[PDB]
Curated annotation (Swiss-Prot), chains A, B, C, D, E, F:
The lineage of its organism: Eukaryota, Metazoa, Chordata, Craniata, Vertebrata. Belongs to the pannexin family. It is a multi-pass membrane protein. S-nitrosylation inhibits channel currents and ATP release. N-glycosylation may play a role in cell surface targeting. Exists in three glycosylation states: non-glycosylated (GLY0), high-mannose glycosylated (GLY1), and fully mature glycosylated (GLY2). InterPro entries: Innexin, Pannexin. Ion channel involved in a variety of physiological functions such as blood pressure regulation, apoptotic cell clearance and oogenesis. Forms anion-selective channels with relatively low conductance and an order of permeabilities: nitrate>iodide>chlroride>>aspartate=glutamate=gluconate. Can release ATP upon activation through phosphorylation or cleavage at C-terminus. May play a role as a Ca(2+)-leak channel to regulate ER Ca(2+) homeostasis. Disulfide bonds join 56-219, 74-200. This is Pannexin-1. It comes from the Eukaryota. One of its GO terms (biological process) is positive regulation of macrophage cytokine production. The chain crosses the membrane at residues 31-51, 97-117, 172-192, 233-253. The gene is Panx1. The modification S-nitrosocysteine is found at residues 30, 301. Widely expressed, including in cartilage, skin, spleen and brain.
Length: 318, 318, 318, 318, 318, 318
């Protein structure tokens, strides 16, 4: 398995019948959630791990049992205020210990907006794309045979902002969490490299008076050099996601092709070129249509004719 | 696998043909049961665990075998009243040891109400939704063709409170268990951080008179700093579930759309707008209908027309 | 996996086309058999286990090899009468060692009655439910069209007690085993907490004369504090099963609905309201019918009409 | 997994379209073969095993390497005549070491008779049951319509003893092996509990003259206390199988119902009540028919009528 | 599993209905990505690994605990500037430690261009190959029966460079990354073999003044001799990929057969021998057609005739 | 699993609808590639491995940590020219260490020719066998009914050498690699048995001046005695493959039956007995036909008649 298992598991696989998520939003989510899970898996891989996360230099007079006590006590002590000293203060010792939980937290928090979309919006969307697509094929069938229900339906969606407000808020939560992650990772990479070293003391309770125990044990959080390096990789990639996420908000500018111009070739269709520059649900439907109706039989036929036009009898001779 | 396995297993998967549970009640149950199982799995992950749950500072004269005896004896001693001292008293030592069983107990107890619903109510519900849905499609078919059995059936359910009392009691047990969990986790997070340290003695039986053994060994429950931190995460999330659970009791206020108004467009239907403000089973059926009949072919057709109305021949021209 | 694996494996899964076991008898069996298997799995989970089941305080002069001999010899000695002392006597040392085999024995013994039902009664039942159900649908079909073979068949089952004696004896064996388990677990929880400590001696054979070996080693059965706590959980749950099991014997009182009253609406049916208060097989067939014929197409139609009656042409207009 | 895995694997599963083995013979074989495999799996489970199967008390002057030599040499020595002493003699030391192979041998030897039946008799049986069953349905069809080939066929099987001699010898081998197993397990349970202790010597070859090595090491076969206890469980269950196996030989007395009396209701059938009290193959066919033809459509119809008789037009009105 | 598992997993399996990637580009990608994953898996295989990645020669007075501290501290120290000395400088110590992450990075970066093709170009290609292939079968059917839409369609693709610019840039990124990998691997193989040895010091913080600790520990990165050898294998194979990748850019020279000459046998076809020596999308379509239309029924028939020609009635007599 | 897993995995399984590889070439490839993978898996099996691949005799004054340093340093040193001595010179120490990679290299290199055949020739072959086979069935159908396209097609293949040059070169590469493997394995088996022993020195850098360290440590490559023995097994089997591979080149002599003589019985066929003694593609097609057309319905019928002839109406009476 080794490192190579992790490549097969998190890079070469979608580890997470309509497309109810846009390809950009899928890839952003997959990178945002998937990268910290890979980095956690790499940081503790046996190829780079040597062993325990900590070790402490106990005196040569200590038995192996007393040394194992010091190592394990000081692993507990990194989060106890009275039994530590570090020139950094105690705060970075928490971050060095809990680093894999903190990356996991970002991975989870970045998934929740997409999970909310799957539940709160996808089923309300799915029914309506299926309707609109089938009605467009009827309009194509009506033309080859040579009510405006879907035109009236879309004209109604033009006067709504319900689904688009769910979408933008889902994007906005993702932006905020990525921004906070970049702030945290910038700080954690800025921590002084020697802040993995701290002084520990076991002299509490019964041990407080024992003259045979040294007043301080030096300990080192051996993995920290891996965590800081991998945090920079995470910071770089998330800093590249930030502008892509911001681009997603510009829905009325994201429509790549005015596909209804392809149907406009038919005399049965109507001038519903409703590229709504107001943030209205129909504009978001256009994106999900452009994601899906590239599969429509009518579109495939009509787009060939529209490209060649750069004649209705031709549709019967295809 | 590492931490990342746990994300794939408990976050990215439904690890637990009609929908017989409401989406809110599913998500509440899935979070309430699933979170403590994740937290237990995190608390002992090899990324954060160092080793044994306890260690004790045996004298340097002790052999490795005698030290292993002290460690294992004191792991047994934390629940034996005569062979301990702690300034906290002995109670928190039980909670520190049995923490993963206590979280497991809440996970189980929070699942039982949903399991009871699966057995006691779902099969009694499933037959009747199937009936009501099919009869609504007949009423739609009768209109396009242009006995009131289902109207009489629903009018009978209006005079019953059998299923709704099973539902409310299932919700009420979930509320009580979540409240008790929040009380426990608030206490366990309030335990003094040093209550993971205690004094142990092996001087019982034959050892009681041995002058070579110290009267007290200091021991530390190394994992406790993880348990307390993770208990706060659990307390926060459950405190967010409490108001959502309470909202579920307000069944007569939870109906989002008066879907029978969509069928009211048909002349064959009748004014059964029985939004019963009394807690009557028909009101609960309306919730399960609104969860399911969004899939009905009649609803999909009629809701388009109802939205456009914001004409029966149109139904034949769709 | 950890503890959380065990929840998924034994709580969230049925780890054990007609329903040939009643839902109450299924759940009783599933709890009775499944709980001790979960408790065994919990008692040795690495979250709560520290290591070996025993340790002994060998002298500091002993080599690590001699200490490992003492630990392993005394694990063998707990069941050898001559090489022990305990104030409890030797009996509880057997129970502390063999605790997981004893719980396994109850798990097996509680499954055998249900396995006997699967073999000895289910195939003799399955043929006859299939017959009775199909004949009831014919009686429904005969009414809508507007020989009494099944009435004569049921009237014959009214004069038999063959299957019901298999059922009651299966229930009776389950009751006896649960009662004996509650007696054992009450005793094992009553064992003094310090009865996990005992004195061991290796001075037999060649070692009997060696002055360098101490006459007694103190040993502790470290897991016993877990076993006693978990035995209380098992005792509580089985004490709750006892009254449920006893309720199962009252077959002539368990019939919840007189379903033949729903068929009594038809003029083709007959007054076979044979709620036999004598323990006769037909009374047990009524329970298995009430478990199954809720799926019958005739029942679904007629129960709607019976509820509305709280008219045969209506059956053609459904 | 623990112990509980073994319950799921060997108790709750058939771990081993006609039924070509009788239910009694299946269950006998499944218990006879399956129980020793479970007992072997239990005897070395980590819940009850402490570690190595042997340990020896080497002197305190021995290095850990020399102690590991003594432990491993003496594990080899238990089967070497010159390098042992035990008051029992050397024989039980073999049985204590090879106990799991001996139980495995019985498990295998008890399976071979059933495997021989699967190969030597089942395919010769399978063709003929299929024939006889189909011809009985024709006789039923011939009656409802109101050559004796199958009657002549069965009358020929009445004059044969080929298959029944394969069956009885298969049963007889199973009886002999179970009896020998009960004899062995009775002896092995009768072995003195201290016969797990023996004296070992490494003083051979170059070591023979070394004055620093003791002339005897005491060793203990730590698992033996488990093996003897589990051997009693095996002895008890096999002693219960013995009378069940003996019952299987009484084929002419085992026929529970004279099913041809149910067909005797038809006027097309004939008085082939050939309950042959001589051990003739037709008597064995009757057992396999009674195991299978409970599934026959004709039998299901005619047995209802036969029970009600406690009229041929009724067969058309079912 | 051993080494042999890796052969089955990465050599004998495609570990990564139209063919939307050319066979050359598939094999280049599969070697470029797959080889470093195999080499990482080999470099840490238990057949060649001895144990830890580092060891240090601590003084004989050090306890085993202090030695384990030195080993683990120095594993952390290889990336800390102040606590090292090496005649190479510190740079190669980073490369020796992070070697498996660096190979993984190249494996990932070499996959991204092919993943971009899968997303950005394959679905835009897939629709159009399906169209062109079906129209070619119609042209074949039209000939056997003895509008030019596809000819006009292809004549339009001749005036576009959209898809080919995606393809060339995808190839160009692959070339750049392979070139940079060859530069890195050439350097890493050129590192002096003794640069796996370095001097470490633990004398920081509290230890800085301890006279009992030596001022330098010698440490060796034991795996480095494997990494350098395997880096040469990777460098050789990538140096062989470079000319193959460069060959892929010569699209207008890569067309192996002028397949439209086979259709030119038909009188319905037209002289669209548009081997565009300008880099125009139609030239790239010809490559994907030559990859796919070898499966076309028309091609299979016509290529036989074209080879024999080295007659239309023959098509009806095949 | 043990050794026996490897038998099931590599001997009893094809671990690697037309047959596009000849049975001889399949078996040669399967043995040539599969044997070294089995031998690698055997050489490190826990039944024959004791532990580490190396051990060194450090002084008795060395700590366990210093000994582990010597063992791991010398494992690195076997490939470093300055820190070794062996009377063999350093070369065989490389071969002893890298033996499993060298066998893996031969396993890979022997697979590539067959993988090249799968890609470069099989799809060009597959279309043409399918054609030729179907046309032969038409010729059979034409005879029973009582154009020469396939005769003209085959007569064209008679004037080509494209595919046969791919085949012979694929065979030739396999021959060369097997020959080189036999040369290497002959040498590696000829290495003196004591060349697994070498002298190591850790006296470099800081250690160079330490008088407490011996100038040489003796080390032994413990596995080498396994590698040399298994190399002889590999050499023997490959030496048996050499003449089989050479036989494959004699394509015009390998045709076992002149199958077209069976079709020559039909009056519709023609005297295409083109056993081309020149190396022409049609001769290779004859081999692949003889491998496949034994499945043809026509062949099965006609070969019966041809054997009986050792009459066309008979074909209708089969």
């Amino acid at each position: 398995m080794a490192i190579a298992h992790l490549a097969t598991e998190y890079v070469f696989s979608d580890f997470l019948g309509l497309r109810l998520e846009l390809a950009v939003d899928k890839m952003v989510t997959c990178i945002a959630v998937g990268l910290p899970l890979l980095l956690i898996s790499l940081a503790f891989a046996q190829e780079i791990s040597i062993g325990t996360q900590i070790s402490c230099f106990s005196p040569s007079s200590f038995s192996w049992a007393q040394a194992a006590f010091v190592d394990s006590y000081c692993w507990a002590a990194v989060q106890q205020k009275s039994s530590l000293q570090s020139e950094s203060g105690n705060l970075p010792l928490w971050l060095h210990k809990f680093f894999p939980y903190i990356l996991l937290l970002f991975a989870i928090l970045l998934y929740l907006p997409a999970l909310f979309w799957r539940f709160s919006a996808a089923p309300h969307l799915c029914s309506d794309l299926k309707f609109i697509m089938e009605e467009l094929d009827k309009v194509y069938n009506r033309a080859i045979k040579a009510y405006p229900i879907v035109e009236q339906y879309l004209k109604t969606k033009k006067n709504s902002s319900h689904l688009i407000m769910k979408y933008i808020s889902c994007r906005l939560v993702t932006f905020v969490v990525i921004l906070l992650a970049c702030i945290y990772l910038s700080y954690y990479f800025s921590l002084s490299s020697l802040s993995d070293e701290f002084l520990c003391s076991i002299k509490s309770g019964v041990l407080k008076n024992d003259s045979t125990i040294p007043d301080r044990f030096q300990c080192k959080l051996i993995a920290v050099g891996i965590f800081q390096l991998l945090s920079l990789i995470n910071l770089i990639v998330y800093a590249l996601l930030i502008p892509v996420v911001v681009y997603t908000f510009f829905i009325p500018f994201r429509q790549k092709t005015d596909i209804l111009k392809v149907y406009e070739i038919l005399p049965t269709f109507d001038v519903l070129h409703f590229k709504s520059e107001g943030y209205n649900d129909l504009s978001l439907y256009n994106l999900f249509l452009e994601e899906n109706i590239s599969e429509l039989k009518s579109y495939k036929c009509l787009k060939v004719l529209e490209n060649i036009k750069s004649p209705m009898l031709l549709l019967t001779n295809l």
